[PDB]
Design a protein around this ligand. Structure first.
Ligand SMILES: CO[C@H]1/C=C/O[C@@]2(C)Oc3c(C)c(O)c4c(O)c(c(/C=N/N5CCN(C6CCCC6)CC5)c(O)c4c3C2=O)NC(=O)/C(C)=C\C=C\[C@H](C)[C@H](O)[C@@H](C)[C@@H](O)[C@@H](C)[C@H](OC(C)=O)[C@@H]1C
Lengths: 544, 529, 541
């Protein structure tokens, strides 16, 4: 019939005991009923915004999947304004889940975001749209820059790992969820024209905590284990950080963070919603091109005396030292000539030494002059502009270290600069592309626990977690979560093996390049093992 | 201390079986709805799962614009029924099968998602090939696939009949007026083939199982209520809206083809409007209705349509010709002195260059505020009775390029289902409120828990693992009248002078009822009560 | 707060605890990421040997091969193939003192990782590596040095610690055989490949997750070992002998470019979509297709038929009409179309495969500043096959015409592509050239299909967009169960799998007809892992 005769004869024609692979006994589970519960908080104000949510109900036996709502207000007025990508996560400074017995679980804003970086849905929900993240311009004092919106922040906790099995049980105890918010300055990208002073005064965080509550008939509570993260931020430009009292750790993550305290946090360009490396680069090239190639009737005006604008010769090639720039613009009027800004942005430590000129990073600029709009429409640009260039704060171009003026752009271009205060920036560039760690050494006391010359620990992290944006992580727990006691790195207090000392070898950069002056901070995250006890309320105990 | 072996495991000998991919040709039957019946009866086919329906799409020859809807294979399905001699074992509505597969990129690609199928192709001669023949594969996801061999549909020497009801070819096709649909609808025939993974099991040990059967109730047009009766044991409840285009001719100004992003829909619309929006002509433009207000662009480039300023600057315009802006391309107004929804006002800057060689304007950059809703407005609503103005002030050429879209699985009020029109949801078990929300938090949980970007407002009752456990259901009380689920929605208030306000809405409520699979004297299902 | 309707609904039968679980103490162990430098050995194939023997290392899994790609300096066009790290691999073999435990062919390891986006990205998929870079001076940097990571997916990773390869105080040798650097590199004639091939050396490093296990309790396990059979060139048959217990059988086709110089007109670089391949081809052809010149164009062969575009704009190449209209053309110059850019035919007065006929409309604007044509919109019928035709076939002895009527400038821009993992007859493996598939277990027919339904099931069951015609026999969960296999009957002759395909035939006047095909049949055989006196495998028969 339908089955092939070769198969029928292979089977039809018994002694050995076999496991039933075609049927299973449908086990009756614990009688329960779930419900999505949303709660309004209590706002408190260094005058940091803190939201407190109290969960106390006889029928809320267990809970998991915490989602924080945030009502973003209508933004009216003049100037350029936009929210940072995944705005909802960037709002969060700290989250604490505590009971009468103390803190059960807590996370720093950046660590919660890092744990959700692989979750596209959670990231989209937190605020990733052209409506929120593109930089909008307000023309009149009553013009709407941003329409009001609601964002949803998934607060991933260890209670979600195995759904109902991992859920936080409530032993007739009061659970308080505390959310500490970062200043609105962090989540906003704006220009000088925008009235931030008024905005910061008028802005208020409007949060609402949602969770999946479970009403369990005759609950049989058993003790569980929980991994609690603990971060350590090293001193400015120090290649070392130490995590004290490490007794039972499931993982250790190492990454870098830039420090922009020495700057005004202003940047030349921002790509808006489009977040690819190419998008960041293109946004920068587009901003520079306005001043880089000028079609004018006589030498261009409105630029500093320090600026050296050169007329493009008949051959099209302009020679800036060793660098040759080919500039050819079509439909240029007979009364006008093509000009090139040979030193748009320049840096140097000594008056007659090596110079880093952004105009030298261009090799070919082709376009057509529009008689109707009286502007140059660029066709193709050949350049060597990188993600680092786009990530250089404006302050460093005009820094005291620089012997030259630095910023030779027009006043128009300078006015379009945007303040970026994103709290979750990693590495030294906006895309965290440049790996500035040449070598990583992890020491458990005096002994060397781990060492690497390549980011193989990041490769394993990215592979094992199926993430495209991982960190140099040392996982100690390869045992299945919830159903087993996690495997940890056991300490030896007597031998001085109760600390994790991380040492890195930062890459050596050129002093005549502005990124050299971007202050660095080594972030070391340690996940400590704790035991959840439900005897006379919920409580946690550090495994030692 | 006693420790569990985490580095080694005893390799259990499984049930002796042999799988085989079996493909069957059906029996076609013809309201003259196309129905395909597939009979599965073999002593050696002990169990089956992973149903895949193949469809041989024919060569499309002739004149006019033609293209298939994205995921054409899923859109073909109106209903699927898996039945035995004891009756229906499992059944699903076309849209619900598609909804269950929306997160499966592979299944969606297989069903027909290509530039070859979905881009709108134009036929120039009556014998010109518009679309080349193709075969699409529709994965009919069933609860028998959840845990592979463990969840498989067992055949107790019983006849299993797979019945596939097909939607009319009108639903899966996007065409213009020039296309001879009358002939196509007559000539078109569904050519199906059902494939499945069959298992020959030596000494099968069948045990009873549980199955979730989806039930849907579609509310009346513009009625914000729907009720699912005889709810005794439900595992979930999904709530969504569907647009109803009966009050229209199902014609739309633009369609982006294969490129399905929100931006792609918007760009396709802007491109279609631009042909009539900015005109380079020798004297005032002709071929437009008297109702049209085409204004010559002044020297400064700014044309003022009320409070809205439109900057229009076209290069290489001949000395004998002038640049013109259509100030009321598409307009809507309920009353003569009320708010006006003007599509030309949705543009702020239009720059381009006139080509002397092709005698046409090549647009460079467009600054506009056009949205996904604009692209989703049926042409009929612009020329609606409620509109005191003419409405459609486009050229006869532009109007002839309009496409009929009859996609049966459209949700919300826009083509991308972006706009959430439910302001408040209220679910009642019997008479008592089971759940209520002011925000789409149930949709957020659905999208998060299922790792889907296109979820619905879903109330999940079962958070217990499937197949290995009896699903956690909402327990009913007949005596208290708690034997039904009533859904009441409050729609988001829109301004009356916007054309989309007149899109008829339909509330869809899906209930997953729990059934017990019994294998005593053939396969049979029993509703848990 | 909980709703009153829920509280009233809840407030004898045995129930499984779904809200709590006993946290079982696992086997005491400690993991460590261990990286090892190899031993390089050298038609004169590069082989890297990695020896794993340590008292602490009890078990291992997740093999990752690191490769140090050197700085590429000099003149000419150069770029690496996408997923360069996987393409480097010819063979991988994990062996003990008792012999080979597990081994895979380079292409099969890549096929097993094609659904893993992360593993593919790590192996080298960037604009920095895969876009074709041009070197202007002999000391100009074409490619900056980079490190690529190749995830060698093994059956020991399936269930993490449970599936891990245990080392019974035995020496485990990981042997990696490398394909020639010619395979992983896309370059032009201007590039000094001769020097590069001499100077290039594979710099590998094997990383793995080692486990130090206190009081390990080793139990025997099962392993699926792949076997590949490549049929004779263009032959629609291949047989895999000694098939006693197989879990699956995959069937696919590969092109053979031995009859060519492996040179191709265009390559899209990093952008790998079908449209990207097509656009890169159109862009390369357009330079010679539409010429703006002062009088008839020069620098083309005598065989070229360059026609001046009439006032009408339409140029008629036989039945095919090409509309060409270029703006801002100088008064002294005219618009010209190359009516036979690439042509193929087997007879002097028969059907022609002309590439110029594959164009219907070409619009653009002439730039006075750069003295070149800037194309705006192109209407064409160019396909993935056209882009996949090797240059040799256009100039082949089968062709009555000259074939390649492009300029010397265009011909110099041709790139050598030697990617070892190309499937089908096109670069995107779009064209399905198998009309029918027949699989025989011994002399009896096991499976037959007229459509690629086995490929559809493979793509669906593995959640992959790039699958093959696969016959899976094991639908039982891995590691926790003995896999389900086709059972042989040596006495009845049923101890081999014979695959017979029916290839759809191409048009003899179309250059792709002369692209050689190869049938590839992959069989996964079941083996038992024994740990008694070292690690050893035994074929299930
Ligand atoms: C993290 O989850 C684990 C929980 C551990 O803790 C502990 C104590 O809690 C558990 C649950 C809460 C379970 O619900 C559970 C199962 O439902 C289950 C098995 C199955 N395991 N074995 C056990 C021995 N038997 C038998 C013994 C003698 C002859 C054969 C065979 C099956 C199991 O052990 C379970 C289990 C535990 O062991 N499924 C079956 O019974 C079955 C009908 C088929 C199984 C098919 C696959 C093989 C299996 O799905 C595989 C893909 C894995 O995914 C799981 C094993 C999973 O492990 C990992 C790792 O993934 C565990 C559920």
């Amino acid at each position: 019939g339908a089955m092939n005769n070769t198969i029928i004869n292979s089977l039809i024609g018994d002694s050995i005991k076999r496991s039933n692979v075609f049927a299973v006994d449908s086990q009756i589970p614990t009688l329960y009923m779930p419900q999505y519960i949303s709660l309004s908080g209590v706002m408190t104000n260094d005058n940091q915004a803190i939201a407190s949510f109290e969960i106390r109900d006889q029928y809320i036996t267990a809970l998991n999947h915490l989602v924080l709502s945030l009502e973003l207000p209508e933004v009216k007025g003049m100037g350029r304004f936009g929210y940072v990508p995944y705005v909802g996560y960037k709002c969060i400074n700290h989250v604490s889940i505590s009971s009468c017995n103390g803190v059960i679980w807590e996370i720093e804003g950046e660590e919660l975001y890092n744990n959700c970086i692989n979750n596209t849905i959670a990231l989209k929900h937190s605020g990733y749209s052209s409506e929120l993240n593109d930089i909008s311009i307000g023309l009149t004092p009553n013009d709407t820059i941003k329409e009001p919106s609601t964002v949803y922040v998934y607060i991933k906790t260890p209670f979600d790992v195995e759904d109902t099995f991992s859920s936080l049980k409530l032993s007739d105890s009061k659970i308080t969820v505390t959310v500490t918010f970062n200043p609105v300055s962090d989540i906003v990208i704006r220009d000088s024209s925008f009235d931030f002073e008024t905005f910061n005064k008028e802005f208020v965080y409007v949060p609402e905590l949602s969770f999946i509550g479970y009403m369990v008939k005759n609950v049989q509570i058993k003790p569980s284990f929980i991994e609690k993260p603990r971060r350590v931020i090293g001193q400015i430009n120090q290649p070392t950080a130490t995590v004290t009292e490490v007794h039972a750790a499931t993982s250790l993550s190492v990454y870098t963070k830039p420090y922009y305290g020495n700057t005004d946090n202003k940047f030349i360009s921002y790509p808006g919603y489009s977040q690819d490396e190419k998008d960041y680069i293109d946004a920068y090239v587009s901003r520079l091109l306005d001043d880089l190639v000028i079609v004018s009737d006589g030498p261009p005006t409105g630029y500093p005396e320090s600026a050296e604008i050169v007329e493009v010769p008949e051959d099209g090639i302009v020679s800036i030292q060793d660098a040759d720039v080919y500039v050819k613009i079509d439909n240029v009027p007979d009364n006008m000539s093509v000009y090139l800004h040979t030193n748009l942005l320049m840096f140097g430590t000594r008056k007659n030494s090596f110079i880093y000129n952004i105009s030298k990073k261009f090799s070919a600029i082709t376009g057509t002059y529009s008689d109707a709009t009286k502007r140059t429409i660029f066709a193709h640009i050949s350049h060597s502009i990188n993600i680092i260039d786009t990530s250089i704060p404006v302050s460093l171009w005009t820094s005291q270290r620089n012997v030259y003026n630095g910023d030779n752009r027009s006043a128009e271009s300078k006015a379009k600069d945007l303040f970026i205060n994103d709290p979750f920036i990693k590495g030294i560039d906006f895309k965290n592309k440049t790996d500035i760690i040449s070598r990583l050494e992890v020491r458990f006391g005096n002994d060397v626990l781990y060492s690497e010359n390549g980011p193989i620990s990041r490769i394993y992290n990215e592979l094992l977690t199926k993430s495209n944006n991982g960190t140099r992580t040392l996982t100690f727990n390869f045992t299945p979560k919830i159903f087993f006691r996690p495997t940890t790195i056991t300490a030896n207090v007597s031998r001085g093996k109760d600390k994790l000392s991380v040492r890195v070898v930062y890459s050596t950069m050129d002093v005549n390049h502005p990124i050299y002056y971007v202050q660095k901070q080594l972030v070391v995250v340690c996940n400590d093992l704790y035991k959840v006890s439900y005897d006379q309320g919920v409580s946690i105990t550090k495994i030692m």
